[PDB]
């Protein structure tokens, strides 16, 4: 029962450098094992970084050479990652993991057997900008029904609350989950259903709330 | 590294069966690429299954199998149950170096397929006098939670300025996306229109809007 726990900064600013580690426990970094890097981006796919043997020999991702720089610590029973001048394309949660080492006759990198021990993850963000409030536009409109909303655009961090007639309005509430986009800000989309006979008489206002940029919004939805 | 390929997103029935292939862009897929096979739930750490080719580790039940097919690897899953449902990923060596595939998204049929309903917003008036304009696709109510959305200018695609999330599990158990195109006043102003294509199950839905 080979455990891997890593660790991490958590936060880091861009153009930076990040420094991950790994520790083993229930094995020895000087057993026949690969010792792995592996991230996945928010909403992607696995993506293979590297591996290391405790000889020293590595092998890196082809298109990240010239960023990565893996080593090993035997006295600690630790190996570690480093990648410079990281972007904010790299976000993402950093796994390590291992694999046997196979041969065929003499000692040689025979790779017959895989990956078997995963770590727990650890979430790394590279905060490409600052704290920013939202910027609250209008989504102005099913027959019977019909759909109005408010465009939170451009905020940062994460936690924003949403509300419709200071939460008098609970039924025909759907509120998206954000997007992450490239430029590190936020953006969701709230919509309300009402029905379209009280677009004229009934006044709809969205609200939101904004702790960490400490800013409060209420816009009025016109038809339009 | 090479490009590895799997299929976007495939359905099984509880207890039916259902494989999963995993292409390369160099050719066939030999035992020296020694494919393995990673189960990923949403929200935990990817699980080992299959290492070279046809290898179960200690944990990976009997229902799952590899085997090369005409020259991809797969892996044959006998018996559904709901606990199988996730994300599939493939890892293979190429020139030293390991290259995991894009992924399938295996969903266990727990209930039929639900169709999306999708909304097109413009860009409001508010946001052209800041000089930005932005378009909102909404998506929601479509089970399983698998999506392709694309974007085209007129008659031409568009994929510089888009941005969309993945599903997440509304209250009714069905999921919900949206995509965001942003753009520039003056490219809203020069087309005579913009949509917004949903791709579910076979079915495409697709919303348009103009600027006069």
């Known amino acids: 029962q080979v455990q891997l726990q890593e660790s991490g900064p958590g936060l880091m600013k861009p153009s930076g450098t990040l420094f991950l580690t790994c520790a083993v426990s229930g094995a020895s970094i000087s057993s026949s094992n690969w010792w792995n890097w592996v991230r996945q981006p928010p909403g992607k796919g696995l993506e293979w970084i590297g591996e290391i043997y405790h000889d020293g020999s590595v092998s890196r991702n082809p298109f990240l050479q010239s960023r990565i720089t893996m080593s090993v610590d035997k006295s600690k029973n630790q190996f570690s990652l480093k990648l410079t001048s990281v972007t904010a394309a790299d976000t993402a949660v950093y796994y390590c993991?291992?694999?046997?080492?196979?041969?065929?006759?003499?000692?040689?990198?025979?790779?017959?057997?895989?990956?078997?021990?995963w770590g727990r993850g650890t979430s790394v963000f590279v905060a490409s900008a600052s704290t920013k409030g939202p910027s609250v536009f209008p989504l102005a409109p099913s027959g019977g029904t019909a759909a109005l909303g408010c465009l939170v655009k451009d905020y940062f961090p994460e936690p924003v609350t949403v509300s419709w007639n200071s939460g008098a309005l609970t039924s025909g509430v759907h509120t998206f989950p954000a997007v992450l986009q490239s430029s590190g800000l936020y953006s969701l989309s709230s919509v309300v259903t009402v029905p379209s006979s009280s677009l004229g008489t009934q006044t709809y206002i969205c609200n939101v709330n904004h702790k960490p940029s400490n800013t409060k919004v209420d816009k009025k939805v016109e038809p339009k | 590294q090479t490009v590895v390929t799997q299929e976007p997103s495939l359905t099984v029935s509880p207890g039916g069966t259902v494989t999963l292939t995993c292409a390369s862009s160099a050719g066939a897929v030999t035992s020296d690429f020694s494919p393995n096979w990673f189960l990923q739930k949403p929200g935990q750490v990817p699980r080992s299954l299959i290492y070279?080719?046809?290898k179960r580790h200690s944990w990976t039940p009997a229902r799952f199998s590899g085997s090369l097919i005409g020259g991809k690897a797969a892996l044959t899953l006998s018996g559904a149950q709901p606990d199988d449902e996730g994300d599939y990923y493939c890892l293979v060596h190429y020139r030293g170096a390991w290259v995991f595939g894009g992924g399938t998204r295996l969903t266990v049929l727990s209930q039929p397929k639900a169709a999306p309903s999708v909304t097109l917003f413009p860009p409001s008036s508010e946001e052209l006098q800041a000089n930005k304009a932005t378009l909102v696709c909404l998506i929601s109510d479509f089970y399983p939670g698998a999506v392709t959305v694309a974007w085209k200018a007129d008659s031409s695609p568009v994929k510089a300025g888009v941005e969309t999330t993945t599903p997440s599990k509304q209250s009714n158990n069905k999921y919900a996306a949206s995509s965001y195109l942003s753009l520039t006043p003056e490219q809203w102003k020069s087309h005579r229109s913009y949509s917004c294509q949903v791709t579910h199950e076979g079915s495409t839905v697709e919303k348009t809007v103009a600027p006069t």
């Open positions: 070279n080719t046809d």
């Open positions: 993991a291992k694999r046997w080492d196979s041969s065929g006759w003499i000692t040689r990198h025979t790779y017959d057997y895989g990956v078997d021990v």
